[PDB]
From a paper:
To further interpret the immunogenicity transition at the molecular level, we determined the crystal structures of HLA-A*2402 in complex with peptide H1-P25 or H7-P25 (data set 1).
The overall conformations of main chains were similar in the two structures. Although this residue is conserved between the P25 peptides of pH1N1 and H7N9, the salt bridge formed between Lys4 and Glu8 in HLA-A*2402/H1-P25 is not present in the structure of HLA-A*2402/H7-P25. Due to the low resolution (3.3 Å) of the first data set from HLA-A*2402/H7-P25, we collected another data set which had higher resolution (2.3 Å). Taking these data together, though the H7-P25 peptide has only one dominant I9M mutation, this mutation influences the antigenicity of the peptide, most likely by altering both HLA binding and TCR recognition. In the structures of HLA-A*2402 with H1/H5-derived peptide H1-P25 and H7/H9-specific epitope H7-P25, the I9M substitution influenced the solvent-exposed surface and decreased the force of anchoring of the peptide to HLA-A*2402.
Numbering used by the authors:
A (entry chain B): 20 to 119
B (entry chain E): 1 to 11
C (entry chain A): 1 to 274
The structure:
């Protein structure tokens, strides 16, 4: 029952413009087993309406999921992505960079 | 178009 | 150019919570089209692509009948495997399954795939010659000996070549708008100091389809893969994809570096310099 730590990437769909409607994507990949919990945060608070893509895997049998939500960033607002998995001693939180 | 094995075969 | 269509099946047991969970998704190249979910209340194959919503209900009823047949096949496949390996039923185990076919630029058959994986490792799979099976462990040799005697390799070969290809052929017509397009990436560099003696050079590729791409860094025309950080290609969510690679460089030696991008939608590969 092999295990894989997920590769987390948080990012905007289009390069961010403050006050313009974008999509926030958190993309986890290369993990195993398949059960995973992903949340999206605004200043540390979980975002309610969030859809995820369908469960699929790559050629190496490693799963990848895409959690996405529509949002309009500001200068102030902090966003992040929180992922827990059986391979993680604690949930890992990834803050969204405009340049990543 | 999904696979259909006429007689479904298991391990 | 060449094209591909794949179905990915994932089954997971949940011992205290009852029946295993089955999830299957269709793909043409990097574009998803259908999906199916065991726990979904619809209990039907659902379109995830706009160009496949036009199919008649005769189509949907046929597909949703076969995917349910596979779902219960894998549910019993899981029971056989917990027996085969003698793992306790308290544990939760996974069975992944993939099948599909490839075609050339003109549409002729190229390759085919029929394979399973148990708990992330290869269990069984169909060889490229499509007359034989590769079986890792002695549990899979049993199923191999089962599937050889039942002539399974011949029936799937008929599917893969006959049915898998013809469906891919109509899909590539139905979706000519989206599928057969190729989106060139929009590229640029970003510069991010860390110390006063160092800086970070990042080379971006944005909004490209298909997702297959090659990113490269160089110094004076010589390849730098030593210091390179390169992220896995990520879906943009709109149907396109994004990727970037980065190197830490001594400041101010920057224009001494070049970034090189290759993609199908590019007539010639690109060279970016700071």
């Amino acid at each position: 029952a092999i295990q894989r730590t997920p590769k987390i990437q948080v990012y905007s769909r289009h390069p961010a413009e403050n006050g313009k409607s974008n999509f926030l994507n958190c993309y986890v990949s290369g993990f195993h087993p398949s059960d995973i919990e992903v949340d999206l945060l605004k200043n540390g608070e979980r975002i309610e309406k969030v859809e995820h893509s369908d469960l699929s895997f790559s050629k190496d049998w490693s799963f990848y999921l895409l959690y996405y939500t529509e949002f309009t960033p500001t200068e102030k607002d902090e966003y992040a992505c929180r992922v827990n998995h059986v391979t993680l001693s604690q949930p890992k939180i990834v803050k969204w960079d405009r340049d990543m | 178009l999904y696979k259909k094995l006429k007689r479904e075969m298991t391990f | 150019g060449s094209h591909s269509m794949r179905y990915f099946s994932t089954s997971v047991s949940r011992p205290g919570r009852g029946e295993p969970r089955f999830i299957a998704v269709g793909y043409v190249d990097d574009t998803q089209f259908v999906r199916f979910d065991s726990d979904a209340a619809s209990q039907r194959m659902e379109p995830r692509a706009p160009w496949i919503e036009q199919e008649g209900p005769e189509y949907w009823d046929e597909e949703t009948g076969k995917v349910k047949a596979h779902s219960q096949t894998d549910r019993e496949n899981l029971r056989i495997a917990l027996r085969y390996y003698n793992q306790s039923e308290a544990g939760s185990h996974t069975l992944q399954m993939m099948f599909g076919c490839d075609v050339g630029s003109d549409g002729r058959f190229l390759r085919g795939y029929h394979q399973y994986a148990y708990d992330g490792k290869d269990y069984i799979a169909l060889k490229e010659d499509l007359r034989s099976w590769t079986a890792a462990d002695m549990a899979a040799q049993i199923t191999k000996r089962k599937w050889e005697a039942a002539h399974v390799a011949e029936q799937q070969r008929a599917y893969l070549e006959g049915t898998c290809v013809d469906g891919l052929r109509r899909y590539l017509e139905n979706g000519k708008e989206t599928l057969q397009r190729t989106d060139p990436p929009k590229t640029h560099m970003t510069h991010h100091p860390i110390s006063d003696h160092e800086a970070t050079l990042r080379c971006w590729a944005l909004g490209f389809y298909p997702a297959e791409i090659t990113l490269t860094w160089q110094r004076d025309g010589e390849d730098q893969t030593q210091d390179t950080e390169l992220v896995e290609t990520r879906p943009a969510g709109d149907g396109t994809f994004q990727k970037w690679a980065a190197v830490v460089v001594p400041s101010g030696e920057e224009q001494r570096y070049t970034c090189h991008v290759q993609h199908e939608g590019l007539p010639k590969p690109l060279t970016l310099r700071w």
